[PDB]
Structure formats: C-alpha cells, structure tokens
C-alpha cells in the first residue's frame, strides 16, 4: 500500500493503543451480526443466535485475536502485504472459498470498530490512511483469486 511517511506515523501510533485481546473479536463479532451470511463459515464456534451471543462468544473472541494478530503482521510489513498474507490467502481462497467482498467487509467493520474505540481521535485523515491499509489487506487475502 501507499501511505505517506506521516500516514504511516499516524497508523502506527493509533495501533499502539489497540487492545490486542479484544478488538479483533469485536470486528469479527460485528461482521457476524451485520452480515449474517458470514456465520455460515463459523458453525463450530457455537451459539451465534443473537448479537449478545455473538459478541460474547468465547470462540469468536479467541479467533478474533488471531485475526487481529494478522492485521498487526500487515502493519509491520506494509511494503509486502501480499507476501505476508500468502498463507492466509490460500486458506481463505483455495480451502474456504470465502468470497473476496467479505474481506472488504471485515476490513470496513474493523475501521468502524477503531472509530468506535477512538472517537474524535479517529480523524478523517487517520481513517483515510487506515482505509489504504484495509484495502491492501483485503487485496492481499484475495491474491489467490487473481
């Protein structure tokens, strides 16, 4: 992804304050509540019948930590998102066949969660930089489809 020196700085600073134990689960949880067809890929996770069950689902939280860990990986390798996500791309594309639009959705839900957490601090400029990052991540994950 592009990201100017200052954007990289803004992105890095905001990420240093992101709860590694919760944000991922909140993003995955909101994806499951807002775009319910995505629940089809998580039957082994248990009860996802209500927003409360989803957000409190222990498996969603634990799994979300891994998802967040992957974004942290991308943020540490902005110049090579495709390589960084290569393994995950084969998993999501060749094994799971997740439609790529869903990668875009989760990225935007993550942006919403960051906005929810940081409030006014999640300024338009900061959001613009993060949109470049989530788009890069979605593209990288969909690589096996290209």
């Amino acid at each position: 992804v592009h990201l100017t020196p200052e954007e990289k700085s803004a992105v890095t600073a905001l990420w240093g304050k992101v709860n590694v134990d919760e944000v991922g689960g909140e993003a995955l949880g909101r994806l499951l509540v807002v775009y319910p067809w995505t629940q089809r890929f998580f039957e082994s996770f248990g009860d996802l019948s209500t927003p409360d069950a989803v957000m409190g689902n222990p498996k969603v939280k634990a799994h979300g930590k891994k998802v967040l860990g992957a974004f942290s990986d991308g943020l540490a390798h902005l110049d090579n998102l495709k390589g960084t996500f290569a393994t995950l791309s084969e998993l999501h594309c060749d094994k799971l066949h997740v439609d790529p639009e869903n990668f875009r959705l989760l990225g935007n839900v993550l942006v919403c969660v960051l906005a929810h957490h940081f409030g006014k601090e999640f300024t338009p400029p900061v959001q613009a930089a993060y949109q470049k990052v989530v788009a890069g991540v979605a593209n990288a994950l969909a690589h096996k489809y290209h």
């Binding site: 807002v34 927003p51 989803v54 919403c112 940081f118 409030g119 338009p124 959001q127 949109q131």
Partner: protein, 141 residues
C-alpha cells in the same frame, strides 16, 4: 428489507443522533472525499476543503434526506422519488459510491456514539443505508 426490529433501531438511533444529523452528514462527506478521492469527481464545482461551508451545507441536505427516509421507512421509493431521479437518472452515480458514503456515515456515527452504536444498531443502520442506496440508484419512474 428491514424487519420491525430494524425499523425500531433506525428510528431510535437516528433519534439519538438528533440535532447533530447535519453535522454528521457533513463529516461523512468529508471522510468520503479524503478516504476515497475518486468520489470527488462527482463534485467538480464544490469547495471540498476541510470545513468548507459548502460541504457543511450539503451535509445538512444529505442528513435531512435521511431523516425524511427514516420517517417514511415503509415507503421510501415514493418519499425519495426526486432524489432517485437526481442520482440514478441524471448523475448516474456508480452504486459503489453509495457503499462508500454509507460506510463513512457508519464510521461517523461510531466515532460520535460510543454509548449507543451497539452491534444491533450498527446492523440495522447498515441495512437502512443499503435500502436508501438501492432506491437512489434505481430508475423507477
């Protein structure tokens, strides 16, 4: 298609937004122009600088249109006929842009509603905005 619960959530959430609707519409527009620069080609004669009076004025119009939609949620095509003509027939806005503006409105709401942007509200508002987007991008006259 909004369920009775979605409608209740949308009316309650937009009610919470309240008098800040116009401001949020303007901030949503600003976030869109900055995050997705391609959208700016639709506003060639506008001053899109941060805080421009033109964007604030336009944000108000967008907000009022949404408020109108919320109040006629069961009959949006009829209530938004004039706006649909403008966006779908005259301007021919690519529907992808509606996903972008909707996302920016959701990001704006999330940033301003730490105590009320619940997952259910987020879900109902997303569906509401998708419905509005479908009406505005459809030519049904």
């Amino acid at each position: 298609v909004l369920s009775p619960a979605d409608k209740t959530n949308v009316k309650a959430a937009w009610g919470k937004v309240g008098a800040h609707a116009g401001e949020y519409g303007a901030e949503a527009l600003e976030r869109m122009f900055l995050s997705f620069p391609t959208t700016k080609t639709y506003f060639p004669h506008f001053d899109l600088s941060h805080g421009s009076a033109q964007v604030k004025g336009h944000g108000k119009k967008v907000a009022d249109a949404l408020t109108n939609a919320v109040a006629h949620v069961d009959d949006m095509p009829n209530a938004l006929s004039a706006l649909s003509d403008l966006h779908a027939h005259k301007l021919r806005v690519d529907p992808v842009n509606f996903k972008l503006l909707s996302h920016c409105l959701l990001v704006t709401l999330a940033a301003h509603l730490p105590a009320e942007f619940t997952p259910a509200v987020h879900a109902s508002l997303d569906k509401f905005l998708a419905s509005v987007s479908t009406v505005l991008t459809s030519k049904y006259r």
